[PDB]
Design a protein around this nucleic acid. Structure first.
Ligand SMILES: *CCOCCOCCS*
Ligand code: NA
Length: 312
DNA sequence: CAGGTC
DNA sequence: CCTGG
């Protein structure tokens, strides 16, 4: 079929393979699990979405990540285009090695990781990540997804249309800093989060030095990146850790939420000892993150993603 | 209220 | 202070 979303069977000549066993990556545990909100399984086991400013469809067999890209002449992805996929999934980070370390120092991980292999962190764009997770407060994956989708339709550049889906790039800072964006985003149902989207776009672009300020947090320390993000409206401790882990190359960031608290007590018998408060608070949440960073090591945020994936 | 942020 | 379950 020359129209529509492709499948491995329908258009074999347009797919290229990255050697990637299923223990290193499971799309079904990584793409709909609340890292990115913009991947869809348009046909069974085939995930479509925007990757490096282009639309891709991904599906995997036992040893191979099959990829196809929609650019005007149809042809399978080139080696350079496939490298964008490897960088997005950070395939040089070997889960077999990470899982071995986490199981070595943690018996509970070793037990529950066996049925949940292939859970890894995407390397997302800071802009998309920052604003997606600004929208994540008081909100669920289903509603976040719709909010992000309508956000991208209204302000993001049109790319291509496959079947009845028009794919849009994520909006620019300039777009999100434009006139009346908050009112517009309110019409799309973002509620109070609409103000924080507009306010954070204007803050970065008009007070912080622009896109280079955000992107160069990738080179700053984790502590520096977290501090800087927390200046932005809508970015609290938890949101900043999400962005640090998922977009700013801080694999030791541990977004502490009540879900992490339940896991900390149930499976690790953890309780706070730097403070005397017994439940969630700034002080105790910080300790909880430090606790998992010394238990799991510099990739604690990835280990958390494995555990989170078990529950869901 | 529980959850996050002001 | 907001908010959705
Ligand atoms: C409970 C949220 O507090 C108000 C700040 O909102 C930040 C996202 S717009
Ligand atoms: Na803030």
């Amino acid at each position: 079929g020359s129209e529509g979303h492709r499948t491995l069977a329908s258009t074999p000549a347009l797919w290229a393979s990255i050697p990637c066993p299923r223990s290193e990556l499971r799309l079904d545990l990584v793409l709909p699990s609340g890292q990115s909100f913009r991947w869809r399984e348009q046909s069974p086991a085939h995930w479509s979405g925007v990757l490096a400013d282009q639309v891709w469809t991904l599906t995997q067999t036992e040893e191979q990540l099959h990829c196809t890209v929609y650019r005007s002449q149809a042809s399978r992805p080139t080696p350079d285009e496939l490298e964008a996929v490897r960088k997005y999934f950070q395939l040089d980070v070997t889960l077999a090695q990470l899982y071995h370390h986490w199981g070595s120092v943690d018996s509970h991980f070793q037990q529950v990781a066996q049925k949940f292999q292939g859970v890894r962190l995407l390397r997302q764009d800071p802009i998309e990540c920052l604003f997606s997770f600004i929208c994540s407060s008081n909100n669920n994956i289903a509603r976040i997804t719709g909010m992000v989708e309508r956000l991208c339709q209204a302000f993001g550049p049109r790319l291509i249309q496959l079947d009845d889906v028009t794919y849009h790039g994520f909006p620019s800072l300039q777009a999100l800093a434009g006139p009346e964006v908050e009112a517009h985003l309110r019409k799309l149902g973002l509620g109070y989060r609409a103000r924080c989207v507009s306010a954070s776009a204007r803050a970065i672009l008009e007070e912080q030095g622009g896109l280079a300020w955000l992107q160069q947090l990738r080179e700053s320390s984790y502590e520096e990146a977290h501090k800087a993000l927390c200046i932005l409206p809508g970015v609290g401790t938890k949101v900043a850790d999400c962005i640090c882990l998922m977009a700013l190359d801080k694999p030791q960031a541990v977004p502490v939420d009540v879900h992490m608290w339940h896991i900390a007590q149930r499976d690790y018998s953890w309780h706070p000892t730097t403070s005397q408060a017994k439940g969630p608070s700034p002080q105790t949440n910080k300790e909880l993150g430090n606790f998992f960073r010394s238990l799991w090591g510099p990739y604690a945020g990835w280990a958390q993603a494995v555990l989170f994936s078990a529950d869901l």
